């Protein structure tokens, strides 16, 4: 029927506390890591390197990279990033896990901050892959190894083969990893809520995940702007039943949502403790 009593953060929180809401899926994008100093390269002034390119997405297009990996690589030296430490949103997703609410987190992001926030591979679908690993492109390497190669401004080449080595990312025009489809196809039969945070839903098939959700399943967007509207979402029409849109920074929305669940305090302590810990290892 209509599981939200109110199309609001207040309504969602209230729903999250009911016994009906057990399995939560988070769909997240570049918008949940920018406060961690990771610039959303899809919604860029950010590029400014020639390296003459027909358009930014070209450097991430797989054909182009294989012939001209340089634009991609000069970038990735430009965003270090100095050191990685995850956001309130990230740590929100951790509390979900800890509280037995996190069915799965599907990320478009390649920073691996979900992991550093305490989320284990079981909990996680790295839809577009990781930097952690890298392979010889020749279908016949660790972070540094590679990290060093990137900061030396020389392109990654295979020890054995001398062919290009790319990080284990899904480039555009590459197929997404298996796990993604097997996971989507049963997660989305079980899901009670959808948190969509920090994403514009301009990448496929990732963004088509919001339409796998059951008709009854409410969906909350925490994004700077509205997105995925039409199966598509419906926040404002008179027909609207299941969808809620909170506009602002991700970190702010997660603190708000957390306040209504009575977790703000725990979350803030958690971010603090974990960031202090990270510094220690320096």
């Amino acid at each position: 029927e209509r599981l939200l009593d109110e199309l609001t953060l207040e309504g969602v929180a209230r729903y999250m506390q009911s016994e009906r809401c057990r399995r939560v899926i988070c769909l997240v994008g570049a918008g949940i890591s920018t406060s961690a100093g990771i610039p959303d390269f899809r919604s860029p002034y950010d590029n400014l390197e020639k390296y003459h390119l027909p358009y930014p997405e070209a450097i991430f297009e797989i054909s182009y990279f294989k012939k001209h990996p340089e634009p991609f690589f000069a970038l990735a030296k430009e965003l270090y990033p100095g050191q990685f430490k995850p956001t309130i949103c990230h740590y929100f997703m951790r509390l979900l896990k800890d509280k037995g609410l996190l069915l799965r987190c599907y990320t478009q992001n390649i920073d691996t901050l979900e992991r550093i926030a305490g989320l284990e591979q079981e909990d996680l679908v790295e839809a577009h892959g990781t930097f952690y690993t890298s392979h010889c492109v020749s279908a016949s390497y660790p972070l540094s190894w590679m990290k060093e190669k990137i900061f030396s401004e020389v392109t990654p080449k295979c020890e054995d083969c001398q062919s290009l080595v790319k990080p284990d990312i899904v480039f555009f025009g590459e197929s997404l990893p298996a796990r993604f489809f097997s996971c989507m196809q049963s997660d989305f039969l079980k899901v009670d809520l959808l948190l969509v945070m920090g994403t514009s839903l301009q990448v496929q098939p990732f963004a088509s995940l919001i339409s796998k959700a059951p008709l009854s399943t409410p969906r909350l967007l925490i994004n700077k702007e509205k997105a995925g509207q039409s199966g598509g979402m419906d926040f404002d029409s008179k027909k609207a039943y299941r969808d809620v849109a909170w506009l602002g920074e991700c970190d702010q929305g997660c603190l708000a949502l957390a306040e209504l669940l009575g977790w703000k305090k725990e979350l803030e302590d958690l971010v603090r403790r974990e960031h202090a810990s990270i510094d220690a290892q320096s």
């Binding site: 899809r42 997405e57 899904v170 555009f172 025009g173 997404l176 301009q202």
Partner: peptide, 8 residues
């Protein structure tokens, strides 16, 4: 095309 990353 199939099911692999593709922008807008």
């Amino acid at each position: 095309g199939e099911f692999e990353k593709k922008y807008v």
